[PDB]
Design a protein around this ligand. Structure first.
Ligand SMILES: *Sc1ccc([N+](=O)[O-])c(C(=O)O)c1
Ligand SMILES: [O-][Cl+3]([O-])([O-])[O-]
Ligand SMILES: [K+]
Length: 131
């Protein structure tokens, strides 16, 4: 076998976490249930959508979600993508493992910043899969 669950969490569920969800589903889909959420939602960043479309991944149908404790409790791995999310993460259930893979916040920047972070996230997820 049954798939494990990975939960990407960030300050918002807008850019970094949405691109992580996009890459995660594509790369980890066979053995993982992939979800993402943020301390706040903010919607799917338009530039994040364009950045992923550029690499042939459609995240335009993703939802911008808040942290669901029901999913968190059932996660094998929680990955925090921003310092804000990591520092505000409470004591987790004993069965849950947590890793922090911080990435710069592309918000308010040019396409170029979304492209950089998009690819850094891609590399991180690919290497995770190849461990
Ligand atoms: S892992 C994690 C990070 C942040 C927050 N938060 O509420 O800001 C949570 C949570 O409260 O469930 C979890
Ligand atoms: O919306 Cl973020 O995942 O970039 O915080
Ligand atoms: K989501």
């Amino acid at each position: 076998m049954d798939k494990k669950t990975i939960y990407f969490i960030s300050t918002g569920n807008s850019a970094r976490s949405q691109m992580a969800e996009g890459w995660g589903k594509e790369i980890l889909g066979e053995g993982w249930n992939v979800y993402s959420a943020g301390i706040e939602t903010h919607g799917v960043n338009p530039k994040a959508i364009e950045a992923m479309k550029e690499v042939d991944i459609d995240i335009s149908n993703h939802t911008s979600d808040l942290i669901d404790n029901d999913i968190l409790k059932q996660s094998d791995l929680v990955v925090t993508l921003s310092s804000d999310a990591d520092n505000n993460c409470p004591i987790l259930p004993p069965n849950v493992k947590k890793e922090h893979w911080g990435f710069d916040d592309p918000a308010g920047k040019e396409w170029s910043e979304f492209q950089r972070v998009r690819d850094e996230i891609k590399l991180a997820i690919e290497k995770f899969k190849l461990r």
